[PDB]
């Protein structure tokens, strides 16, 4: 939408949780589990491929 | 709100004009400009409680902390009407110490 403006990635993930109706404390208080789940999900794609 | 469906930027409004066998759309959009960098933090710890912005981000100009809206820089001081509380400050990665100002009790002298 213009020039790239940097933001830390967990804070971008919190904006995106807001965009679906969940408060952002739910992301910050679960950060490690959410990242573990994303990593297992990405590791399952290359296994199916 | 569909990205790039009505031009580049944040769609404000669009005007139609007729062409021969066709149509022309003049899209008016909003484009952000002249950014500055800041230090930032996800929450703020005060009295053993974690505070999150209601809307906006916590930013630091070098020595002080403010809340701003995310798309236009307009800094304000962090109060209990700017933020909400959840939990204690032991679980959030990158939490920062600052004071969150209450209006009522300095009204009550
Ligand atoms: C929410 O669901 C997750 C499942 O992804 C739970 O986390 C797992 O809990 C089991 C316990 O049976 C552990 O063995 C796993 O190692 C956990 N997974 C990860 C990625 O940490 C989590 O406990 C659930 N939360 C609640 C409150 O029920
Ligand atoms: C960050 O902004 C603050 C403004 O709040 C500057 O601090 C001073 O703060 C006092 C009381 O809050 C004001 O009376 C002053 O007018 C403010 N400015 C000055 C120049 O004294 C602070 O200087 C700013 N810091 C940086 C690094 O820009
Ligand atoms: C951002 O990354 C920096 C590393 O570049 C982290 O700084 C380190 O913090 C640890 C404490 O967890 C210290 O032991 C290291 O000495 C620091 N390294 C440097 C180079 O400063 C910083 O903590 C990270 N920020 C967050 C919020 O995790
Ligand atoms: C932010 O403020 C809290 C509140 O005091 C600090 O917590 C103290 O941390 C030190 C060192 O980690 C401990 O020795 C104290 O026992 C803690 N106090 C309490 C009341 O728990 C915290 O360290 C501060 N954060 C930073 C980065 O300085
Ligand atoms: C912000 O700082 C970075 C270096 O950390 C620099 O590359 C960038 O151009 C700066 N942008 C602004 C708007 O100051």
Swiss-Prot record, chain A:
Source organism of this protein record: Severe acute respiratory syndrome coronavirus 2 (2019-nCoV)
Source organism phylogeny: Viruses, Riboviria, Orthornavirae, Pisuviricota, Pisoniviricetes
Record gene name: S
Highest taxon in the source lineage: Viruses
Listed name of the protein: Spike protein S2'
Function: Subunit of the fusion protein that is processed upon entry into the host cell. Mediates fusion of the virion and cellular membranes by functioning as a class I viral fusion protein. Contains a viral fusion peptide that is unmasked after S2 cleavage. This cleavage can occur at the cell membrane by host TMPRSS2 or during endocytosis by host CSTL. In either case, this triggers an extensive and irreversible conformational change that leads to fusion of the viral envelope with the cellular cytoplasmic membrane, releasing viral genomic RNA into the host cell cytoplasm.
Swiss-Prot record, chain B:
Effect of residue 64 to Y: In strain: Theta/P.3
Protein name: Spike protein S2'
UniProt-annotated glycosylation sites, renumbered to this chain: 37, 61, 97
Function description: Subunit of the fusion protein that is processed upon entry into the host cell. Mediates fusion of the virion and cellular membranes by functioning as a class I viral fusion protein. Contains a viral fusion peptide that is unmasked after S2 cleavage. This cleavage can occur at the cell membrane by host TMPRSS2 or during endocytosis by host CSTL. In either case, this triggers an extensive and irreversible conformational change that leads to fusion of the viral envelope with the cellular cytoplasmic membrane, releasing viral genomic RNA into the host cell cytoplasm.
Cystine bridges: 45-89
Result of changing residue 34 to H: In strain: Kappa/B.1.617.1
Gene name of this polypeptide: S
Full-protein residues shown: 1038 to 1146 of 1273
């Amino acid at each position: 939408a213009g020039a790239a403006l940097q933001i830390p990635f967990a804070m971008q993930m919190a904006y995106r949780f807001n965009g679906i109706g969940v408060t952002q404390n739910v992301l910050y208080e679960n950060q490690k589990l959410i990242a573990n789940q994303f990593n297992s999900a990405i590791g399952k794609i290359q296994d199916s491929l | 709100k569909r990205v790039d469906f009505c031009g580049k930027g944040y769609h404000l409004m669009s005007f139609p004009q007729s062409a021969p066998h066709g149509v022309v759309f003049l899209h008016v959009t909003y484009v952000p400009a002249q950014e500055k960098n800041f230090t930032t933090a996800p929450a703020i710890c005060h009295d053993g409680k974690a505070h999150f912005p209601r809307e906006g981000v916590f930013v630091s100009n070098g020595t002080h902390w403010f809340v701003t809206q995310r798309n236009f820089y307009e800094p304000q001081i962090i109060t209990t009407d700017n933020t909400f509380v959840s939990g204690n400050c032991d679980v959030v990665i990158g939490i920062v110490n600052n004071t969150v100002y209450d209006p009522l009790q300095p009204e009550l002298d």
